[PDB]
Design a protein around this ligand. Structure first.
Ligand SMILES: *[C@@H]1O[C@H](CO)[C@@H](O[C@@H]2O[C@H](CO)[C@@H](O)[C@H](O)[C@H]2NC(C)=O)[C@H](O)[C@H]1NC(C)=O
Ligand SMILES: *[C@@H]1O[C@H](CO)[C@@H](O[C@@H]2O[C@H](CO)[C@@H](O)[C@H](O)[C@H]2NC(C)=O)[C@H](O)[C@H]1NC(C)=O
Ligand SMILES: *[C@@H]1O[C@H](CO)[C@@H](O)[C@H](O)[C@H]1NC(C)=O
Ligand SMILES: *[C@@H]1O[C@H](CO)[C@@H](O)[C@H](O)[C@H]1NC(C)=O
Ligand SMILES: [Cl-]
Ligand code: NA
Length: 755
């Protein structure tokens, strides 16, 4: 096939990792420049693998690395492969977006999967610790297993962590062989996700075999699979806009049986299970001692599917199909008339969860969604390269004025293109309310300087997105925001603009990465942990003030956005060793929004990871947090002073008279103050340490409190999982749901909180 003309294939390549010492390292690789023929006849395995591995990248024996990113581009074509495509650390596998190429497994293909994102060596050790396998894309492919015997074949071994995505992939598999068919689209053994969007699975035994701590996956279609989704294990998982068609089983979540369920919780929203034998197989019964197997259905059609939910241990139909299920919950519920203050285990349909119209797509009535833009129809001439227009991206030069001048002059038909590099910002950059910005494989935008962002008593925005009250169209994608040295006055992104329409203002694959990597000066040398002393709280190890602030009137659509304060060092010489980085606050949302967050995560801030203050119209699915591992050395009262301008939590006051005082002063996973119409569909809010000691896990008591609802906040929580917090949820100062009353297979889990 002809080249597609997609801008990405032809845009001038001027990028380079600023902190890789090799001036000739090449981030972009077109597989055909490595000898791939793309005709489906010549075996292209070696050429594709060489395009990935070229340049001394992070493969076997390399724990992790941020200075060897790669964007591996596959022009339109068919690529015959006979062994796995090994995706090295920090790789974007980018098929052509206009005409997604086919990865065609040879009949004699051998190996784990057509694409392997985390190989096992001969001794059974992964190349990368699964929970550290960050910063990846696979997008725009057809993966064809149909030449392989039905007894073998997996499309992608997707064993990954945060800031990863699968997008726009079709998996074509055989339908013959009965019980001996073993083909599957995704094979996922474990990990810590992550996002998937816009996938189609045709045939096979399983569309996907899934096992992971937590994941958000939406707009998935399954056609003629035996079981569409085999959920092997999880803590939580949120599915939205899933279409299952003519399968034997939709979601199998009964692994382990009624006395050993390995699936923690599943949420299924805005979905359709059509012409399928059994919609969902579960082993849950409300008399069981634990919360394993929790399930939420919200707005799910069951057309032509006579058994919507089946208890496959007893064989009993729990919910009849051939009707829409407005809402179903099984697991423990609190609040309202059903659960009350003590909580109650239930397995029942119930009344619809009504969401405000501002959060919905008016065309479908589903919660609004929009995938990461790839600008397929935009000509290369419309892209304005920052390096072509005066920004150096060298990680030292002050690029503030050059970037500001680009932002001030770019027209709405153009797109600002951040060539890969590291762009030092030394004072506030004002982003206008009409702009589109996209990056070459996660360029770094770093708050730097020696004064402007240094004062936590007088914090300042790094990127100020619109001015207060403005409406417009602002899109950013494929970028990382961070600090160069400590910048405890930096508000990394202040989001003032509101979209003209849903999805017109947002962030896709845009991450805030505070410390831990080359260029930050916040690495193992400077910030190594020392739990054996009282922490000095080194000034050289502070991070930012606040990673994201949606101010009153701001409205944003966030999808695949990781707000991460480093718990460990990311370059290979450090061997994943742990560090202390002191970052005040994660994500703060105020005002009437709306705000959507799909597949967001906020981890290791001191005061809170997510906070809603005087907020309305917030939809998050699913969310994930961690407390910083150094707490309580120091505890959450240090080193950021309480600032009422950000409604900061005041732990010295709030923990007064705590019955569990030793571990009370710890970062909030989620805090809501005077906020309503907030909807959280799935949450994994974890506390794994106390001053790097994990003894507290044995009694699920690393911290005292995890979610705080204050000022009669109406926060509608579904599939809330928390790890090792005595109290999962506290309302107006009273502990409501205790971990001990809601034990799952690892976390504790509340299916449904009625506010
Ligand atoms: C769900 O994802 C699928 C897969 O990307 C989308 O289907 C593609 O839609 C585009 C735009 O119409 C077409 O050009 C492609 O041919 C489609 N691909 C396939 C495999 O069908 C689909 O649009 C998405 N649906 C929603 C509601 O977002
Ligand atoms: C929920 O998960 C827990 C943890 O896996 C299950 O408890 C385990 O059950 C297995 C039997 O399959 C035992 O071998 C383990 O010793 C148990 N561990 C603990 C910590 O109790 C529990 O049975 C599951 N509950 C339900 C209702 O499925
Ligand atoms: C803290 O003490 C332990 C002994 O339990 C030791 O192994 C570790 O190296 C010490 N840490 C530092 C930073 O010295
Ligand atoms: C609490 O939220 C309401 C909106 O329901 C708002 O009118 C009120 O001003 C808020 N209270 C404070 C103290 O800001
Ligand atoms: Cl993404
Ligand atoms: Na302008």
């Amino acid at each position: 096939q002809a080249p597609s003309g997609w801008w990405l294939a032809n845009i001038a390549r001027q990028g380079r990792p600023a902190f890789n010492p090799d001036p000739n390292y090449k981030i972009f690789r077109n597989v055909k420049d490595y000898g791939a023929v793309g005709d489906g006849v010549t075996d292209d395995t070696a050429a594709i693998n060489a395009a990935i591995s070229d340049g001394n990248r992070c493969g076997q024996g390399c724990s992790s690395q941020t200075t060897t990113p790669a964007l591996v581009y596959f022009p339109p074509g068919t690529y015959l492969v006979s062994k796995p495509i090994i995706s090295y650390y920090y790789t974007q596998l980018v098929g052509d977006a206009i005409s997604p190429p086919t990865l065609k497994a040879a009949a004699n293909f051998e190996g784990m999967a057509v694409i392997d994102a985390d190989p096992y060596d001969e001794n059974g050790n992964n190349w990368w610790t699964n929970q550290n396998n960050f910063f990846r894309q696979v997008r725009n492919f057809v993966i064809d297993l149909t030449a392989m015997p039905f007894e073998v074949g997996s499309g992608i071994h997707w064993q990954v962590a945060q800031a990863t995505s699968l997008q726009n992939i079709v998996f074509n598999m055989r339908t013959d062989g009965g019980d001996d068919n073993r083909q599957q689209g995704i094979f996922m053994d474990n990990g810590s996700g992550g996002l998937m969007v816009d996938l189609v699975f045709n045939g096979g035994r399983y569309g996907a075999f899934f096992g992971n701590q937590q994941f958000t996956t939406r707009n998935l279609t399954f056609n003629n699979c035996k079981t569409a989704i085999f959920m092997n294990w999880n803590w939580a998982w949120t599915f939205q806009d899933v279409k299952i068609n003519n399968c034997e089983v939709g979601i199998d979540m009964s692994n382990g049986g009624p006395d050993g369920q390995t699936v923690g919780s599943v949420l299924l929203l805005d979905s359709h299970i059509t012409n399928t034998g059994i919609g969902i197989k579960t082993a849950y019964d409300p008399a069981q001692p634990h919360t394993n197997g929790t399930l939420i259905l919200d707005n799910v059609e069951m057309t032509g599917t006579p058994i919507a939910v089946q208890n496959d241990a007893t064989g009993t139909t729990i919910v009849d199909g051939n009707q829409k299920i407005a809402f179903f919950a099984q697991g423990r519920t609190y609040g309202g008339s059903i659960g009350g203050t003590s909580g109650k285990a239930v397995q029942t349909t119930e009344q619809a969860i009504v969401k405000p119209n501002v959060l919905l797509d008016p065309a479908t009535g589903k919660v609004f969604t929009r995938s990461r833009p790839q600008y397929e129809d935009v000509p290369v001439s419309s892209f304005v390269s920052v390096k072509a227009n005066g920004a150096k991206g060298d990680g030292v030069t002050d690029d503030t004025d050059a970037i500001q001048a680009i932002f001030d002059s770019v027209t709405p038909e153009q797109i600002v293109y951040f060539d890969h590099g590291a762009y030092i910002i030394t004072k506030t950059v004002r982003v206008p309310p009409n702009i589109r910005i996209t990056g070459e494989a996660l360029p770094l935008i770093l708050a730097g300087g020696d004064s402007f962002f240094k004062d936590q008593a007088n914090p300042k925005p790094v990127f100020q997105v619109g001015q207060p009250g403005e409406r417009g169209r602002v899109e950013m994608s494929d970028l990382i925001f961070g600090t160069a040295g400590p910048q405890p006055g930096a508000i990394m992104m202040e989001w003032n603009v509101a979209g003209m329409e849903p999805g017109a203002a947002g962030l896709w694959d845009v991450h805030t990465r505070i410390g831990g990597y080359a260029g930050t000066q916040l690495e193992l040398e400077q910030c190594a942990k020392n739990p054996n002393i009282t922490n000095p709280i080194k000034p050289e190890c502070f991070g930012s003030f606040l990673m994201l602030h949606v101010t009153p009137g701001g409205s944003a659509y966030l999808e695949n956005t990781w707000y991460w304060v480093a718990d460990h060092a990311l370059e290979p010489e450090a061997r994943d060793q742990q560090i202390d980085v002191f970052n005040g606050r994660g994500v703060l949302i105020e005002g009437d929004g709306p705000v959507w967050g799909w597949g967001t995560s906020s981890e290791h801030s001191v005061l809170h990871n997510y906070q809603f203050n005087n907020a309305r119209n917030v939809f998050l699915a699913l969310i994930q947090t961690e407390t910083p591992y150094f707490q309580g050395n120091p505890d959450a009262t240090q080193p950021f002073t309480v600032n009422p301008n950000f409604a900061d939590p005041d732990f010295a006051t709030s923990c007064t008279n705590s019955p569990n005082p030793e571990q009370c002063k710890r970062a909030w996973g989620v805090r809501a103050i005077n906020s309503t119409d907030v909807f959280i569909y799935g949450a994994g809010l974890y506390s794994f340490f106390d001053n790097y000691d994990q003894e507290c896990l044995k009694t699920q008591s690393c911290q005292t409190n995890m979610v705080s609802l204050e000022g009669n906040s109406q926060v509608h929580l579904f599939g809330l999982s928390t790890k090792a917090s005595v109290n999962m949820l506290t309302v107006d100062g009273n502990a409501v749901a205790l971990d001990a009353d809601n034990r799952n297979n690892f976390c504790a889990t509340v299916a449904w909180f009625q506010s």
